[PDB]
Symmetry: C2
Subunit: 357 residues, 2 copies
């Protein structure tokens, strides 16, 4: 088989999900539905889950519910959990990667030691990045290089529970392979989960990664009690610096991708939801009296804040190219977050007599 | 004088403001500051106000405060109120139009019957439109045609009081005349009111007008108790249909203008503030039990909802070109607002098995 249609000649495509978590579980509902309803896909969707606990694999297989991460939501019975990668990846035509980047390297490394089919197509559903030599590597690219298969990217204005509860959501699939996009769209599209396609992954993945800096900034605005005029200004600047970061460091950024679900929509969903803006808001109110680590436990129930991390590496890349002048917001946000800069510096960055041309 | 620099040879430029209202008063603070501080501008800024009441002209001239529309905010003393157009427009080099489009035709008509200098430049600061033969005409264009002077456009993520209270705000000046833009930027730019320029007015003004439809949609989402995933999706679609409306009916729409203050930022400021989303939200909860007129009194303290009006004329232009299929959101929003369609139709419009290419 040299493509998906070659494989479709002999029979339906086998879908496999990698990951355990609220979003992964919610997606298994979406994927399991289409796998059953669509003649192109094999009904059984194999899902690799981490060996957590009463053991998680058995709960899903027997009770058909992720009682830990997606409690209360019945999952489709055609989902089949497995504890080992081999029983999920072998003979899989379509690989859905929903693994947190805090674990992505280990998983990919374990696979490389289990045979991935040459015609197999992959897709990354995790918002974030991988660090390689202090440089930011986007997930679909990293998966696609580490393994040797095309990797598309899915991101959208998505909150695991809203999707799981069948509320109207959208998502954007980015992919350089046109024959992959037609199929991935069918794997995921449902009436409550509408899919648009774009021909590049870079913008889709930068949005999912850097939106957390914008959410962090929104928190800072909330914490400082700033009016909406001012918060909207900060958001705008964050978006434009996100675009510039893509252009400078990843050679391109199509601004039109902000009109897609992974862009503007996911940004406003991200600061109007979760606890992550609240976390940055509470940080700026405490000033230096509390560290991020303390607020992560106190606010996010032990979870690490994605925004602070993304900012650290984004700023580092900016700093080494000596472009901090062209990224005023990201720069001051880094100063305030990690270099004990007075929160008042946020507004002072933009409240000046500098006249734009 | 054939240009502003010809006039600058003989002396400083005379600024005049047309309009009375909270935004007009807030702007007089901005303009009056720069008029004093800048050597290019004559210190006295003449302001034409409607003959309201203790009479309004005298309050501003004596008490230096708009006690009706911008109560509590001291205005600069170099602002000088006048009740008649002639005492404001004659010998004026720079005309700032802050007149509600509910009155714009009368004012422009009265001027045409008072001599506008041939070298004079104008700018429109009112978000909205003018109806001419059931067609939507943008303000700067209408001013520029009715009178015979170039007219720029100013719009931004601006709330009269936030600007008046010297909170960090931004604004976007659009203008086809490059020599006007350099000056308009100086008239308005302050540390709390930062100005970016763009070379076209169409996008700037469509945003200011059609954002109200998007705000109306946001209200509908709030009223229907929809999750953020779903509201963000609706907003996204509203933005894209706003773009399409510009492209179709005004021959062009630069999407990058959404990255400016008048675009995306003003949209999120508009639905996160005011009472206008709340008004549309309360409408959809009442279904047909309450009319818009009732909710305008009840919610907006007697004020007309800009969103409903904009939708009526936007839809009309869409309908006459038979393009309702390409504007699904605007179409269903019109149906729900004016044709007694069930609010459930909002989500049904997008929750389908239609697959996008």
């Amino acid at each position: 088989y040299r493509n998906l249609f070659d494989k479709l000649k002999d029979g339906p495509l086998k879908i496999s999900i990698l990951g355990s978590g609220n979003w992964a579980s919610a997606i298994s509902k979406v994927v399991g539905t289409n796998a059953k309803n669509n003649y192109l896909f094999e009904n059984e969707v194999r899902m690799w889950i981490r060996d957590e606990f009463e053991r998680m694999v058995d709960i899903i297989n027997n009770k058909h519910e992720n009682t830990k991460y997606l409690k209360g939501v019945p999952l489709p019975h055609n989902i089949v959990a497995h504890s080992d990668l081999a029983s999920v990846i072998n003979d899989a035509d379509l690989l859905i990667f929903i693994v947190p980047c805090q674990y992505l390297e280990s998983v990919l490394a374990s696979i490389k030691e289990i045979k991935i089919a040459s015609h197999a197509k992959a897709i990354s559903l995790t918002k974030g990045f991988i660090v390689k030599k202090n440089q930011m590597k986007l997930c679909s690219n990293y998966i696609s290089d580490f393994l040797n298969i095309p990797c598309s990217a899915l991101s959208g204005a998505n909150i695991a529970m809203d999707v799981a509860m069948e509320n109207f959501s959208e998502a954007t699939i980015g992919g350089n392979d046109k024959d992959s996009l037609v199929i991935w769209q069918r794997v995921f599209d449902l009436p409550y989960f509408k899919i648009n396609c774009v021909n590049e992954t870079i913008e889709v993945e930068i949005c999912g990664a850097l939106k957390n800096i914008i959410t962090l900034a929104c928190g800072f605005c909330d914490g400082l009690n700033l009016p909406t005029n001012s918060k909207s200004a900060i958001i705008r600047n964050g978006i434009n610096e996100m675009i510039l970061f893509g252009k400078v460091f990843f050679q391109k950024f199509n601004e039109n991708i902000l009109l897609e679900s992974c862009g503007f929509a996911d940004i406003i969903t991200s600061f109007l939801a979760g606890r992550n803006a609240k976390c940055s808001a509470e940080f700026i109110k405490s000033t230096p009296k509390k560290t991020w680590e303390e607020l992560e436990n106190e606010i996010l129930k032990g979870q690490k804040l994605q925004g602070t991390v993304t900012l650290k590496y984004v700023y580092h890349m900016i700093k080494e190219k000596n472009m901090t002048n062209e990224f005023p917001l990201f720069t001051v946000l880094h100063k305030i977050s990690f270099e004990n800069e007075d929160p008042s510096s946020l507004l002072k960055t933009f409240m000046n007599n500098k006249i734009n041309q």
